[PDB]
Structure formats: C-alpha cells, structure tokens
Amino acid sequence: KNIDGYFKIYSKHTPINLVRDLPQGFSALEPLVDLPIGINITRFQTLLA
Amino acid sequence: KNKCVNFNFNGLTGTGVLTESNKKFLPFQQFGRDIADTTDAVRDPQTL
C-alpha cells in the first residue's frame, strides 16, 4: 500500500503445512522497512522464477 | 532517570518521571500509549 508517498512493507514468516489452499488461520504482520518514495503508484506486477 | 523534567520526544511533549518497567515490547514499536490516547512508555534506541 502507498499512503501519501510513504510506502510500507509488513513482513511475516511462520512455518505451515499446506498442500494447495490458503491457511484458514489468523496471524499478524510486523513492519520491516520504510521507503518514503513520494511517487504515485497505480499498478503493480509480481515476478516469478 | 527518576526526575520530573520536561520531555521532548518524537511525538510526545510533556512532563513526567522516568521509572522502570517490566513489560516486553515489540521490536518495531518505538513507544507505547494508554487506552484513551496517553503516551506513557517510550523505548530508548541506544539502550534496549
């Protein structure tokens, strides 16, 4: 998300045990860094390997 | 510590006494507040 140019990254790492679907549980997300880019972002794209 | 002096923090301007605490805060949280929006615990960036 991007609010007033301040970009935030909320990270979370936890061990799970899945096969296909999303975990139907509950957790929290802690911030990692802070990037005051000050630009407007309208679209995005996720890269793969 | 243990003085009733003026406090000029990043987001808190007041007067209080720094006392010891037994809590365990989150590593990203820099300060803590009370229920009805009253900052009562500010961590130190130098000494953990």
Query: A-side interface with B, Cβ within 8 Å?
Result: 30-31
Largest CA distance in chain B: 29
Method: cryo-EM
What are the structure tokens assigned to A8, written together?
């935030």
Resolution stated for this PDB structure, in Å: 4.3
Dihedral angle sign, alpha carbons of residues B42, B45, B46, B48:
positive
Residue numbers in A near B27 (CB within 8 A): 30
B1-39 CB burial, b ≥16 within 10 A, e <16? eeeeeeeeeeeeeeeeeeeeeeeeeeeeeeeeeeeeeeb
Does the beta-carbon distance from B26 to A30 stay under 8 Å?
Answer: yes
CB-CB contact of B18 with B3 (8 Å): yes
Nearest CA in chain A to B27: A30
Question: Residue A35's closest CA among A4, A11, A5?
Answer: A5
**How, if at all, do strands B4-8 and B31-33 pair?**
unpaired
Q: How far is A49 from chain B (nearest CA, A)?
A: 31
* Chain B residues with at least one Cβ partner in A under 8 Å: 26-28
